């Protein structure tokens, strides 16, 4: 299970066992066209303490592309339970506008939480964007 | 009613059963609840719990609400084995303003007026 991210073909990387804080690694493409990962994991603080999203895997994600202006990127995390609602429905609001982000769960993640997915997901940046706290 | 908390589902049919849930506390005294009449989770009040305290979300598609308290950060918990959140101080309510934000969802479906929202 490989995944496209613009030129390159990128399958998962090993991460750390889940042990209840998410451990993610983060891969987008540079002005140049070269290949670029960060490792993020959850907990932190975050400039958006109002989105319970902001601090997780593909919260941290979907903020480093705003700020550096990326617009295609690809993220892993480790997290069994999957990809949670909170970043399912607030997404795309980090999200700068139109810019592409796909989250993939572990493999066999099985939800817990009623609007959390196992499945990967392709947000695509709207137009709004995080309210200050 | 789906109710999720760091255990679990239930289904809960009346409001006394919710109010002893939205009680319960099984690790770091603090609990993480998801409040859903869907299948797909959409709408949904998605609670965080701390002691006494509370932030309460309301989601519904292209819907995001945060409750509005009275600012730094609060630390509550995700999960059982203690991943941790960091949330706004402005967003912290009272446990049982909480309460009576649960048993309005749970009687309407839809986004309490009990509390004073922010919208993301
Ligand atoms: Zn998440």
Redesign the pocket.
């Known amino acids: 299970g490989s995944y496209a991210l613009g030129p390159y073909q990128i399958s998962a990387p090993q991460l750390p066992a889940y042990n209840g804080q998410t451990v993610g690694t983060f891969y987008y493409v540079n002005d140049a066209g070269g290949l670029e990962s960060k490792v993020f994991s959850s907990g932190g603080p975050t400039p958006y303490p109002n989105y319970a999203?902001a601090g997780?895997v593909?919260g941290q994600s979907a903020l480093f592309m705003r700020d550096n202006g990326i617009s295609e990127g690809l993220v892993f995390h480790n997290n069994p339970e999957g990809?949670?609602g909170?970043?399912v429905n607030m997404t795309e609001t980090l999200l700068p506008e139109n810019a592409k982000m796909t989250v993939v769960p572990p493999e066999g993640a099985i939800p817990v939480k009623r609007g959390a997915t196992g499945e990967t997901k392709v947000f695509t940046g709207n137009s709004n964007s995080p309210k200050s706290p | 009613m789906y109710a999720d908390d760091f255990d679990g589902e239930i289904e809960i049919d009346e409001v006394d059963s919710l109010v002893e849930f939205l009680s319960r506390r099984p690790a770091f005294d603090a609990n993480n609840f998801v409040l859903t009449f869907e299948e797909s989770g959409f709408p949904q009040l998605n609670i965080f719990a701390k002691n006494d305290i509370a932030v309460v979300y309301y989601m519904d598609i292209g819907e995001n609400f945060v409750s509005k308290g009275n600012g730094g950060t609060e630390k509550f918990y995700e999960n059982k084995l203690g991943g941790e959140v960091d949330l706004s101080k402005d967003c912290v309510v009272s446990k049982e303003q909480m309460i009576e934000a649960a048993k309005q969802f749970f009687a309407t479906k839809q986004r309490p007026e009990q509390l004073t929202w922010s919208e993301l």
């Open positions: 999203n997780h593909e990809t949670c909170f970043c």
